[PDB]
From Swiss-Prot:
Coiled coil: none annotated. This is Papain-like protease nsp3. It comes from the Viruses. It comes from Severe acute respiratory syndrome coronavirus 2 (2019-nCoV). It is found in: Host endoplasmic reticulum membrane. May form homohexamers. Interacts with N protein.
Length: 165
């Protein structure tokens, strides 16, 4: 199962790890992708997860968008986890670099409550432009299910743990 995670709360855990390497090792029931509304997995966590699936995630995602149209900012969809997990929960946090409403971050984390346990990144952090300290706070105050957070950046991981209230 999950190993080397620091316990932050009753249900939130955190580790300095590459979420792709964590997914390949654990093969969790659910891996969360930091998706955009189009499911275009170009960079950040999305690009890295998609590359690990040999682009199968993108092919499946393009079929999903062709059928359903785009997701909402704050929304999600469940697709296959391919070689990484049973399922991938594609969650759209607001991208502050694209001017999206940061209040939608709580709505984005509410999607995690539909799954008992998830391997996840901090939503809207990294290339999405939001403050990761704020994202962790919203995560702990919103998610009630078991979430194992993988933070790629060591320096950010140390800052998140040391500043956690
Ligand atoms: C696995 S990779 O694509 O070679 C490198 C990588 N790993 C990441 C984890 C989180 C965000 C971006 C990331 N880029």
């Amino acid at each position: 199962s999950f190993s080397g995670y620091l316990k932050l709360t009753d249900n939130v855990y955190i580790k300095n790890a590459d979420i792709v390497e964590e997914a390949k090792k654990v093969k969790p029931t659910v891996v969360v992708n930091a998706a955009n509304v189009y499911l275009k997995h170009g960079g950040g966590v999305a690009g890295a997860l998609n590359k690990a699936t040999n682009n199968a995630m993108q092919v499946e995602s393009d079929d999903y968008i062709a059928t359903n149209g785009p997701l909402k900012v704050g929304g999600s969809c469940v697709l296959s986890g391919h070689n990484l997990a049973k399922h991938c929960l594609h969650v759209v946090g607001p991208n502050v670099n694209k001017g999206e409403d940061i209040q939608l971050l709580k709505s984005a984390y509410e999607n995690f409550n539909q799954h008992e346990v998830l391997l996840a990144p901090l939503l809207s952090a990294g290339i999405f432009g939001a403050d990761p300290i704020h994202s962790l706070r919203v995560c702990v105050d919103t998610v009630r299910t078991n979430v194992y957070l993988a933070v790629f950046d060591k320096n950010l991981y140390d800052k998140l743990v040391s500043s956690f209230l």
